[PDB]
Design a protein around this motif. Structure first.
Motif, short mmCIF file in Angstrom:
data_model
loop_
_atom_site.label_atom_id
_atom_site.label_comp_id
_atom_site.label_asym_id
_atom_site.label_seq_id
_atom_site.Cartn_x
_atom_site.Cartn_y
_atom_site.Cartn_z
N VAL A 1 -3.00 3.37 -14.53
CA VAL A 1 -3.51 2.51 -13.47
C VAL A 1 -4.82 1.82 -13.86
N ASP A 2 -5.08 0.68 -13.24
CA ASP A 2 -6.22 -0.13 -13.65
C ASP A 2 -7.54 0.65 -13.63
N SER A 3 -7.76 1.48 -12.60
CA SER A 3 -9.00 2.23 -12.50
C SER A 3 -9.20 3.15 -13.68
N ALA A 4 -8.10 3.70 -14.21
CA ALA A 4 -8.19 4.61 -15.34
C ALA A 4 -8.51 3.88 -16.63
N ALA B 1 -12.05 -9.56 -9.73
CA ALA B 1 -12.17 -8.11 -9.79
C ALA B 1 -13.17 -7.60 -8.76
N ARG B 2 -12.87 -6.43 -8.22
CA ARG B 2 -13.82 -5.67 -7.43
C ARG B 2 -14.08 -4.39 -8.18
N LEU B 3 -15.36 -4.08 -8.38
CA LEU B 3 -15.76 -3.10 -9.39
C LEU B 3 -16.82 -2.14 -8.86
N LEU C 1 6.67 7.47 2.52
CA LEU C 1 7.84 6.71 2.13
C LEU C 1 7.48 5.53 1.23
N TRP C 2 6.36 4.87 1.51
CA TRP C 2 6.04 3.64 0.77
C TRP C 2 5.81 3.88 -0.73
N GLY C 3 5.49 5.11 -1.13
CA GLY C 3 5.17 5.39 -2.52
C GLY C 3 6.31 6.00 -3.30
N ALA D 1 -9.55 2.27 -1.62
CA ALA D 1 -10.17 3.55 -1.96
C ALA D 1 -11.50 3.70 -1.26
N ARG D 2 -11.91 4.94 -1.05
CA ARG D 2 -13.25 5.26 -0.56
C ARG D 2 -13.75 6.40 -1.40
N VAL E 1 -10.76 9.22 -2.04
CA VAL E 1 -9.41 9.11 -1.53
C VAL E 1 -8.84 7.78 -2.05
N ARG E 2 -7.58 7.84 -2.49
CA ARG E 2 -6.95 6.74 -3.18
C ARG E 2 -6.11 5.85 -2.28
N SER E 3 -6.22 4.55 -2.51
CA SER E 3 -5.25 3.62 -1.93
C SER E 3 -4.65 2.78 -3.05
N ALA E 4 -3.33 2.58 -3.00
CA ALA E 4 -2.61 1.83 -4.02
C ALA E 4 -1.62 0.87 -3.41
N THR E 5 -1.48 -0.31 -4.00
CA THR E 5 -0.46 -1.24 -3.55
C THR E 5 0.92 -0.62 -3.80
N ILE E 6 1.84 -0.94 -2.91
CA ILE E 6 3.18 -0.36 -2.92
C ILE E 6 3.86 -0.66 -4.25
N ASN F 1 -13.59 2.04 -6.89
CA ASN F 1 -13.05 1.39 -5.69
C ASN F 1 -12.92 -0.09 -5.98
N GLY F 2 -11.69 -0.58 -6.04
CA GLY F 2 -11.47 -2.00 -6.26
C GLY F 2 -10.19 -2.27 -7.03
N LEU F 3 -10.24 -3.33 -7.83
CA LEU F 3 -9.09 -3.87 -8.50
C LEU F 3 -9.56 -4.66 -9.71
N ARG G 1 -15.02 0.62 7.33
CA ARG G 1 -15.60 -0.54 6.64
C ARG G 1 -14.79 -1.00 5.44
N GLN G 2 -13.48 -0.83 5.53
CA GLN G 2 -12.60 -1.08 4.40
C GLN G 2 -11.86 -2.38 4.59
N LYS G 3 -12.15 -3.37 3.74
CA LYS G 3 -11.52 -4.68 3.88
C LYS G 3 -10.17 -4.74 3.18
N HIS G 4 -9.97 -3.89 2.18
CA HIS G 4 -8.76 -3.91 1.37
C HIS G 4 -8.00 -2.63 1.50
N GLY G 5 -6.81 -2.74 2.09
CA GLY G 5 -6.02 -1.58 2.42
C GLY G 5 -6.33 -1.10 3.81
N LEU G 6 -5.32 -0.52 4.45
CA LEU G 6 -5.43 0.01 5.79
C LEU G 6 -5.94 1.46 5.82
N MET G 7 -5.75 2.14 4.70
CA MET G 7 -5.96 3.58 4.62
C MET G 7 -6.11 4.01 3.18
N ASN G 8 -6.21 5.33 2.96
CA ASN G 8 -6.36 5.86 1.62
C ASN G 8 -5.56 7.13 1.52
C1 4NK Z 1 0.26 1.70 0.59
N1 4NK Z 1 -0.47 1.17 1.74
C2 4NK Z 1 -0.66 2.21 2.76
C3 4NK Z 1 0.44 0.18 2.33
C4 4NK Z 1 -1.77 0.60 1.27
C5 4NK Z 1 -1.64 -0.76 0.54
C6 4NK Z 1 -2.97 -1.32 0.01
C7 4NK Z 1 -3.20 -2.61 -0.17
N2 4NK Z 1 -4.41 -2.73 -0.71
C8 4NK Z 1 -4.95 -1.54 -0.75
S1 4NK Z 1 -6.59 -1.15 -1.43
O1 4NK Z 1 -7.26 -0.01 -0.69
C9 4NK Z 1 -6.42 -0.89 -3.23
C10 4NK Z 1 -6.80 -2.13 -4.00
N3 4NK Z 1 -6.60 -1.89 -5.44
C11 4NK Z 1 -5.39 -1.53 -5.96
O2 4NK Z 1 -4.35 -1.40 -5.31
C12 4NK Z 1 -5.34 -1.32 -7.47
C13 4NK Z 1 -5.11 0.17 -7.67
C14 4NK Z 1 -6.25 1.07 -7.22
N4 4NK Z 1 -7.41 0.78 -8.05
C15 4NK Z 1 -5.85 2.55 -7.47
O3 4NK Z 1 -6.76 3.35 -7.78
O4 4NK Z 1 -4.64 2.84 -7.36
C16 4NK Z 1 -8.29 -2.40 -3.70
O5 4NK Z 1 -9.11 -1.45 -3.67
O6 4NK Z 1 -8.60 -3.56 -3.46
N5 4NK Z 1 -4.04 -0.63 -0.38
C17 4NK Z 1 -2.80 0.50 2.40
O7 4NK Z 1 -2.58 -0.33 3.30
O8 4NK Z 1 -3.79 1.27 2.31
#
Ligand code: 4NK
Ligand code: 4NK
Ligand code: 4NK
Ligand code: 4NK
Lengths: 229, 228, 229, 227
Positions: free
Chosen positions: B131-134, B162-164, C64-66, B1-2, B86-91, B113-115, B33-40
Motif C-alpha cells: 500500500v502507498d503508505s508503506a 498527495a496528502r502527507l 463487506l466492502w473490503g 486514517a486518523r 485507525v486505517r481507512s482504505a478505498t474499496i 494519513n493521506g494518499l 474532522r475527517q474530510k477524506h473517508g467516512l470512517m476508519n
Molecule cells: C471503505 N470505506 C468505508 C467506504 C471508506 C472509503 C474511503 C474513501 N477515502 C477514504 S480515506 O480515509 C483514505 C485515503 N487514502 C487512501 O485510500 C490510500 C490508502 C491509505 N493510505 C491506506 O493506508 O490504506 C485518504 O486518506 O485520503 N476512505 C470510508 O468511507 O472511510
C-alpha cells in the motif's frame, strides 16, 4: 488443545508461552504428548490477572505461530497468574475467538482440553460460544470452581467418552483436572507451572496421574483423586 | 486514517486510544474532522516503546471498535511513547494487518494519513506492505527521520495531489507533518499528545497549521515551516 | 443490520448484493434508511439455494466492502432464492462469522435486523452463536416458519423494547416481519425482492408498514398485520 | 505449499480440492510428499475461470480445513479451469490473503511452491504482496507466460538455491514448471489434473521429472526439459 498456567512471581506472557524451547508456540504445530489431533492451529488465547486482580484476555482464531502482534507484544505483558492455550478443533466446528480458551466469568480463567457431548450438559444462556468447551465452562462456572472435582466426575459419568482436562486460575490459585489427557507440573523457586506437556526438559517436571484434581495455592501443590464409577 | 501519539509519563494504551470520549476508538466509526473517508474501519495499529526502548506493535485488519482482545488488554499496556492509528482504505485496496499503521524500522514507529501516487515514489524491497503508505514509510525511513521535512516537501512536489500527514516516534521524540490534513497538539502536565483530531473538548487543544513540521522532545513542542 | 432476499428466476449474488448503486455493499458503509447504527461493518453473509435445493452460505466477520474474495466470486454464484445481510453490532458484542446472518436450520435461511433481550427467550442447544439474533433464530426455527408472525408478536410482548425484523426463505417462499425497522418490496417480472431498504431509486419499490408479516410464494406478495397485545 | 490445477470438463472446486481422500484439504494438515514445511496452514486460495473466461479468486489467510464458507459453497462453484493452493510460510512471515496463491494478472492465475531470494529479483511496484512468491509472480507476469520456461530457467541460475515450482492457467491452458519440488499429472477421461502430489491412489498418476516444463491444452500433455 494444549494449555499452560503460571502462579508465582511476575512472568511475561512471552516467557511462558513463546520462549520455552518446547512451549505452547512449538506445541501449536508440533505437540509431543498429544493423542488427539495432530496440532493446535485453530486459535489460541492468553489470559492473565493485572495488578488490580482484573482478568484480561487476548484471544484469536488464527494459528499462534503466525500472530506477529502477539510475538511483538507478549514480552511486555507480565503477570503473577496466567492461563494460555492453543486450540485444536475437529474439521467443521466453528472457528472464532470466542471459542478459544481461556473462557472467563470475570473471576476465573478456564481452559478445556478434550471433548464432551453437549447433549448431556444443561442448556445455558451464559456461554461465550456454542462449542462444547464453552458449554462445559458455563456449567463449571455455574457450579463454582470449588466444586470442579464434582462437576468433572459427574460429566465424566454422563458421557463416558468425554475427555475433561480443565486448567483454571483466579489470580491467586490454579485448578486443574486430568480426565483422559495429559498434564504435568513444574515447581520453581518463584512459582508453579501446570501444562498439558512440559515446555522444556527441566528435571523438575513431573506428570500428573489421570483422573486427578490439581490445586495450587499458598505455595502448596495438591494432587488429589477424582471419583470414578 | 486518523492517528494519535503520546510522549510523556507512562500512559496506558486504553487511556490514550479507547477511553477518551472522542478518541481513536470513536474516530474509527465517527470522526469529527475527517474530510477524506467516512470512517476508519479498515484496520488499526498501536505501537509503543517498552522500558528497554524496544518498539512493539499490535496491528489488525479489523475495525478497532470490535476488537475485544485489545479492549481487554490495552489498559494493562503502559508506555512513555505511543503511536496508534485507525486505517481507512478505498474499496478494493488490500486489507491486511501489514498495511495498518504504525510501520517500523525498529527504531522509529510511523503512521501516514493521506494518499500518494506510488508511481512517483522509488521502488523498494523494504516495504511492509504494497500500500502507498508503506512505500512512503520505506522512503522516509531510508532518508532518515532527521530529514522528514525535506522528504515530505520533495514527495509533495512530485505529487501535487498527495496528502502527507506523518506521525512518528522513537521512544523519546515525536515528529509530525501537516500536508493536506489535520493535526492538533495537547500539552498535559505529564506529556504531549499529537493527534489527527482532539480526543475531547479540552481547551488546551490547538491546531497545527498546514505544511509544518512538529518536533516534540521532553515535552518541548517546536513547530517549523516546511520548505517552499 | 440490513438484509435483502430474492425469490424468482436465477440472479447472481453480485447482482443482488454488490452491483446496485445503493445495494448491500453500499449499505455496509452508507445505508440510507437506517435509524440504528451508522453502518454495517461487523460482518456479512450470503445464503442461497442451489439447483438441488441445498442451502449454502458464505459468511464473514469483516466489512463487506473490503472482501476481495466475495467481490471476485459473487458474480459466478446464481440462485432462485437468496437471503443476504450486512451486520451491525453494538461495541463489545462477539465478532465472528457464526454471528452473521443468515442463520440456517437446513431448510430455511433467516436474517434478523434489530435487538432482543436474550433473557426473555427460551434456552436452546441449537443456536449457531451466542448473539441475540442467533438465539431468536433458534426459537423461530423451533416454532416453525408457518408461525413466524405469532412468534414475533409473542417475543414483542415479552420484550417491548425489541426490534424484530425477520427475513427468511426456504427456496420456494419468502417470509418477513416488520417490527420496529424498515422493509420494502420490489416486484420484478422475474421475481420478488424484499429488502431493509431499496437498493436503488426504482419507483416500483413499496414500503411495508410496521408490525406486519409478508409472505411471498407462487409470485404472490401477501401482507398481513400481526396480533394485537 | 501445495497446489493443484484442472483443465477439462466442468468440475466443482469441492470435487477437486475438498473431496479427494488425499487432496488439498488433507494436504493442508497432512501432506504426503512435502519436504519443506510440515503442513500448509498459513492460508489458501482457489482460482477459476467462469463461463465467460473471467478469472475469479477466493483467497484466505486461514487454514483451509476450517473455512466453513468454502466447505459450504465450493460444491456450487464449477469450472473448466482451476488453480488452487494451500500456503506454508516460515514463522514470522506476513500472514495475509494477498500472499496466498493464486496470484493473477487478469489473464493468468499463478501459484508458486518453493523459495527464492528476493535480492536477485528486480524491484517491482506491481506485486500483490511483499512475500517472495508474489515478487516472483510479478516477474513472471511481466515477462509473459509464453516465456515461463525461460524466466524460471533464468531465476534458477540467478539463485542456485531457489525452488521454483510454478502452476499456472489462463482458462484454456495449463503451464507448470518443476524446479526443486514435486509435481504429478493425472489424465482423466474428462480432463487433466496437475498437482504437487496425487490426491488419491489412482494408478494413472505419474510424476513429472525435475527441471521440466509442462504444457497442457486440448487434452495434450507436453512435457519438455527447461531450455
Ligand atoms: C471503505 N470505506 C468505508 C467506504 C471508506 C472509503 C474511503 C474513501 N477515502 C477514504 S480515506 O480515509 C483514505 C485515503 N487514502 C487512501 O485510500 C490510500 C490508502 C491509505 N493510505 C491506506 O493506508 O490504506 C485518504 O486518506 O485520503 N476512505 C470510508 O468511507 O472511510
Ligand atoms: C483440523 N485438524 C488440523 C485436522 C485437527 C483435527 C483434530 C482432530 N481431533 C482433534 S483434537 O485436538 C480436539 C478434540 N475435541 C474437539 O474437537 C471438540 C472441540 C474442542 N473442544 C474445541 O475447543 O474446539 C479433542 O481434544 O479430543 N483435532 C488436528 O489434527 O489438529
Ligand atoms: C460498532 N458501530 C460501528 C459503532 C455500530 C454500533 C451500533 C449501534 N447500534 C447499531 S445497530 O445496527 C444493531 C442493534 N442491535 C444489536 O447491536 C444487537 C446485536 C445485533 N442483533 C447483531 O446481529 O449483532 C440494532 O439493530 O438495533 N450498531 C454502528 O454505529 O453501526
Ligand atoms: C509455520 N509452520 C507450520 C511451522 C511451517 C514452517 C515451514 C518451514 N518451511 C516451510 S515450507 O512449506 C515454505 C518454504 N518457502 C517459504 O517459506 C517462502 C515463502 C513461501 N513462498 C510463501 O508462499 O509464503 C518452501 O516452500 O520451501 N514451512 C510448517 O512447518 O508448515
Amino acid at each position: 488443545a494444549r494449555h499452560v498456567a503460571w502462579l508465582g512471581a511476575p512472568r511475561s506472557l512471552a516467557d511462558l508461552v513463546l520462549d520455552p524451547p518446547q512451549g505452547l508456540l512449538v506445541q501449536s504445530y508440533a505437540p509431543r504428548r498429544q493423542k488427539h489431533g495432530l496440532m493446535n492451529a485453530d486459535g489460541w488465547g492468553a489470559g492473565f490477572f493485572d495488578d488490580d486482580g482484573v482478568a484480561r484476555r487476548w484471544r484469536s482464531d488464527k494459528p499462534l505461530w503466525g500472530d506477529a502482534s502477539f510475538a511483538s507484544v507478549a514480552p511486555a505483558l507480565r503477570s503473577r497468574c496466567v492461563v494460555a492455550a492453543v486450540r485444536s478443533a475437529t474439521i467443521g466446528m466453528p472457528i472464532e475467538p470466542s471459542a478459544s480458551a481461556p473462557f472467563s466469568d470475570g473471576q476465573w480463567l478456564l481452559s478445556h482440553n478434550g471433548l464432551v457431548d453437549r447433549g448431556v450438559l444443561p442448556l445455558t444462556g451464559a456461554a461465550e460460544s456454542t462449542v462444547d468447551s464453552a458449554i462445559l465452562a458455563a456449567l463449571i462456572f455455574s457450579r463454582g470452581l470449588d466444586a470442579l472435582g464434582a462437576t468433572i466426575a459427574e460429566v465424566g459419568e454422563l458421557d463416558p467418552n468425554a475427555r475433561l482436562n480443565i486448567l483454571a486460575a483466579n489470580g491467586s490459585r490454579l485448578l486443574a483436572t486430568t480426565w483422559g489427557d495429559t498434564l504435568s507440573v513444574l515447581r520453581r523457586p518463584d512459582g508453579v507451572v501446570l501444562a498439558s506437556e512440559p515446555y522444556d526438559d527441566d528435571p523438575g517436571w513431573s506428570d500428573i496421574p489421570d483422573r486427578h484434581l490439581v490445586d495450587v495455592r499458598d505455595a502448596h501443590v495438591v494432587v488429589t483423586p477424582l471419583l470414578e464409577h
